[PDB]
Design an enzyme around this catalytic site. Sequence first.
Site, mmCIF file in Angstrom:
data_model
loop_
_atom_site.group_PDB
_atom_site.id
_atom_site.type_symbol
_atom_site.label_atom_id
_atom_site.label_comp_id
_atom_site.label_asym_id
_atom_site.label_seq_id
_atom_site.Cartn_x
_atom_site.Cartn_y
_atom_site.Cartn_z
ATOM 1 C CG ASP A 48 23.135 63.349 81.118
ATOM 2 O OD1 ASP A 48 22.454 63.726 82.077
ATOM 3 O OD2 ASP A 48 22.746 63.414 79.950
ATOM 4 C CB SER A 50 20.427 66.060 82.016
ATOM 5 O OG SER A 50 20.250 64.648 81.956
ATOM 6 C CG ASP A 52 14.717 63.122 83.746
ATOM 7 O OD1 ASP A 52 15.184 63.590 82.688
ATOM 8 O OD2 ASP A 52 15.088 62.061 84.249
ATOM 9 C CG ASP A 101 11.447 63.593 69.232
ATOM 10 O OD1 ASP A 101 11.066 62.435 68.904
ATOM 11 O OD2 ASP A 101 12.160 63.832 70.232
#
Length: 129
Positions: A48, A50, A52, A101
Amino acid sequence: KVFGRCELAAAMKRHGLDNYRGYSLGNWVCAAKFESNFNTQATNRNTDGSTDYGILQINSRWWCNDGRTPGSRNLCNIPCSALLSSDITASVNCAKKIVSDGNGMNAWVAWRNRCKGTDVQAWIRGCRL
Ligand SMILES: [Cl-]
Ligand SMILES: [Cl-]
């Protein structure tokens, strides 16, 4: 910096990760091994677009700002580059927000696939903590 197993365990222990949200220290060491091979400078790009970052491979999609993940969040309020430091404070502090989360350590694919349901205490066996 490429940590030793026991060196990383002790750094994580000092930064309050042992039993954090019920996850014993071996879980975090195991995740780090398989995410980054204990290398604070690890980066990997996702399909995508992004990226890490660091010892726990924290994703720019949600957690840090790298200036090139359009329409992403910065929930840990840090440049992603701070996750690459030899000092793991920022990685650990961000990891604590992630694991809180609601998904626990399942956020870390390598944890889910390689550590979960294994004997994770083996990862700290032998270490002086
Ligand atoms: Cl961005
Ligand atoms: Cl995996």
